[PDB]
């Protein structure tokens, strides 16, 4: 732990003809395990991790049924939202939804979440206690009233606290060889001279999993954030992640600077010097 299961759904309307383009992806932690793409020929939920291929045809039948139903919910939503916001049929609009559950190291439920956006802006989301809704504007307040009367939060809370967690546990066990393995960052430092008086030190972390990591610089043992650049953590494409952090230093003073790396896969925090 900790661990999580999350599903992400995107529907984009197609003015002029036919249904929205719908893409659904499921993750356990930072590992995608299933996907559905309305533009794909199979029209089935497809495996994306070898451990989910253990599941039988009944699982796949069921997930395909549910995800296609999800797609129709978004299709109807796009039309409704166009009405709420008094928009024309001319433009493409998007709905996004994400939900999922987090468990701690003991694999017990920690938190659940369910959030919805229209055209990239908050629309409605379950509150932290999974018992009520946060509606961003009057259109979403109309939806909140509807979902209150239909007891949607109660259904979702039951799922998030029960089924979501139970299935996360199942996946963690079935996929133990990779899901429960941590890959510590492989680190090194590079050096470049911009001019006679200024150098850049870059501290690299490669090949790590999960994606959560902290990379920081110190100067003479004290936190250094000025004259640093930290790139967004990025996927390697083989399941692992990469990140780097750089600092600009006076040439000849490189020895004052140290990079510090924290990650789940490192029992002791790590230090690099030039």
């Amino acid at each position: 732990g900790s661990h999580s299961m999350r599903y992400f759904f995107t529907s984009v309307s197609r003015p002029g003809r036919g249904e929205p383009r719908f893409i659904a992806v499921g993750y356990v932690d930072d590992t995608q395990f299933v996907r559905f793409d309305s533009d794909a020929a199979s029209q089935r939920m497809e495996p994306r991790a070898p451990w989910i291929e253990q599941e039988g045809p009944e699982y796949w039948d069921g997930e395909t049924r549910k995800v296609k139903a999800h797609s129709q919910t978004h299709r109807v939503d796009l039309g409704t939202l166009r009405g709420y916001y008094n928009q024309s049929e001319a433009g493409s609009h998007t709905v996004q939804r994400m939900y999922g559950c987090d468990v701690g190291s003991d694999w017990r439920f920690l938190r659940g979440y369910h959030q919805y956006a229209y055209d990239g802006k908050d629309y409605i989301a379950l509150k932290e206690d999974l018992r009520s809704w946060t509606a961003a504007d009057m259109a979403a307040q109309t939806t909140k009233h509807k979902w209150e009367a239909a007891h949607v939060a109660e259904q979702l809370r039951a799922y998030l606290e029960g089924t979501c967690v139970e299935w996360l546990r199942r996946y963690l066990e079935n996929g133990k060889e990779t899901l429960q393995r941590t890959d510590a960052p492989k680190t090194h430092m590079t050096h470049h001279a911009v001019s006679d008086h200024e150098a850049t030190l870059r501290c690299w972390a490669l090949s790590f999993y999960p994606a959560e990591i902290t990379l920081t610089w110190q100067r003479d043992g004290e936190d250094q954030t000025q004259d640093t650049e930290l790139v967004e953590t990025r996927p390697a494409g083989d399941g692992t992640f990469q990140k780097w952090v750089a600092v600009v230093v006076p040439s000849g003073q490189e020895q004052r600077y140290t990079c510090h790396v924290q990650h789940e896969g490192l029992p002791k925090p790590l230090t690099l010097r030039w």
């Binding site: 992400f8 995107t10 984009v12 893409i23 992806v25 995608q32 996907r35 793409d37 994306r48 493409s92 998007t94 996004q96 994400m98 956006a117 055209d119 990239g120 802006k121 908050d122 590079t190 470049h192 870059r202 490669l206 790139v231 967004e232 990025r234 996927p235 390697a236 494409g237 083989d238 990469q242 780097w244």
Partner: protein, 99 residues
Amino acid sequence: IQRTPKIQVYSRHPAENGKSNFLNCYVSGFHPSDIEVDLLKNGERIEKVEHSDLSFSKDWSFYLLYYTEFTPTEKDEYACRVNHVTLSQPKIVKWDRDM
């Protein structure tokens, strides 16, 4: 809302001349989702390029990884070219291996 993509171009594994590898263009932070991404070898479009399934961050911004198998050589230059509604002109980011 319209949010401009961030772009990083980099290799899957440590880049060594003569060794099979993957060139990545990771585009993130953008909205809406429609985006054009090309990987270029010596300024020319690479044909065999695959990409991840569209997903998004907590702030609702989209991200995608585009990737292609390549074998780095000493003279070949690589880049990613991205167009999006938020960009008046395509944005090109060169692969810098010495980073």
